[PDB]
Amino acid sequence: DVNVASITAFKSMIDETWDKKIEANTCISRKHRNIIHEVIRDFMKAYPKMDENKKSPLGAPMQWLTQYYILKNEYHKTMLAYDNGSLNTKFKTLNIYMITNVGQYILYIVFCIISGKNHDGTPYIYDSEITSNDKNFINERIKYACKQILHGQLTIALRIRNKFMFIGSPMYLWFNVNGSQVYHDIYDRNAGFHNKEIGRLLYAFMYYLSISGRFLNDFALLKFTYLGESWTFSLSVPEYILYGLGYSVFDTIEKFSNDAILVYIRTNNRNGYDYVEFNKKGIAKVTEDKPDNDKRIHAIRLINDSTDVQHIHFGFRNMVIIDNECANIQSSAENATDTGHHQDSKINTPIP
């Protein structure tokens, strides 16, 4: 299953943005984020499982991490061959240190991910490591890969002095990864990344994952699954988390309580957002049409009464959804606001 639509859309995005200089507030638009999100998800879907004769006994998702699988992934092959190979040729000119333009940033980060390559050129996992039963060894390699996607983007942000460019590390790259360790490994060692005008969506993504681990066990209130990769939540779930991890509100969503959730799915005609509400335990299935890339949203406001006041702002309207006006994107409790609801319509391990 090769979704060529996302390939075509990706190529056109790169054409539009190739020569667009990254400035202080520059961010990736809703449309472009949604294209990026589709590309990573469509890459995964094209070769979604390991082969029985070349399988990790740990259950590490080597189909998305190794050349053995990626080189036979038909989405990867079609993407790298598209338009006479033009995107692959562009990609090979790039590295972290020279990137200055939006389309260079997007192409480099994305093509590294869907090629299974670290920024230093090494594969995330070597083919000879696929079958390893050494959990600590494999865990360390995946943690490195996950961190370097984010660290490389922070290095770019600090050099250019940019606030809002952001592509996440997809969920499969968090195999046994401790989000508090990722956060502290990076932030404890570079004071420049703390500047409030630098790397704010990267910060928001990592900060949330530093306080809310992937598997919350009995504290989990929600669970998402895509192609066997699951994640749990007990707070509101900002769009920067769902976009960053590669999850969709059209994925398998399970509720473990009867708290209300508001699942935001699309922009409307009133400078607002449309959402579906769910309350009961079990599967929460959005049956509305999938919006186009220009309009699609992925965000959840969780409503309960035991959420700590220090965490309530993750569900605030203008933080839980990424503003399409780059300069006004919210990224922490200092700037999160919960105003504007009259424009919206109802359609119907770290532990917090």
Author numbering: 17 to 364, 382 to 385
Provide the publication's sentences verbatim.
Vaccinia MV employs a highly conserved eleven-component fusion protein complex to mediate virus fusion with cells, but how it functions remains unknown. The A26 protein binds to A16 and G9 proteins of the viral entry fusion complex at neutral pH and, when purified MV was treated with acidic buffer, the A26-A27 protein complex dissociated from MVs at low pH, inspiring our model wherein A26 protein is an acid-sensitive fusion suppressor of MV. However, the acidic pH of endosomes triggers conformational changes in A26 protein, which is subsequently released from the viral fusion protein complex, resulting in viral and vesicular membrane fusion.
Our limited trypsin digestion identified aa 395–420 as an unstable region so we generated recombinant A26(1–397) protein and purified it through affinity and monoQ ion exchange chromatography before solving its crystal structure. The overall A26(1–397) structure consists of 18 α-helices and 6 β-strands, with an N-terminal α-helical domain (NTD; aa 17–228) and a C-terminal β-sheet domain (CTD; aa 229–364). Additionally, an inter-domain disulfide bond is present between Cys43 and Cys342, consistent with our previous mutational analyses. Consequently, the A261-397 structure appears to present a novel fold with two distinct domains. This implies that the helix α2 is important for maintaining protein structure stability at neutral pH. Thus, our crystal structure of A26(1–397) protein strongly supports that His-cation pairs involving both His48 and His53 within the N-terminal region most likely contribute to structural alterations by increasing electrostatic repulsions under acidic conditions. Our results show that the NTD of A261-397 is highly positively charged, and the CTD of A261-397 is relatively negatively charged.
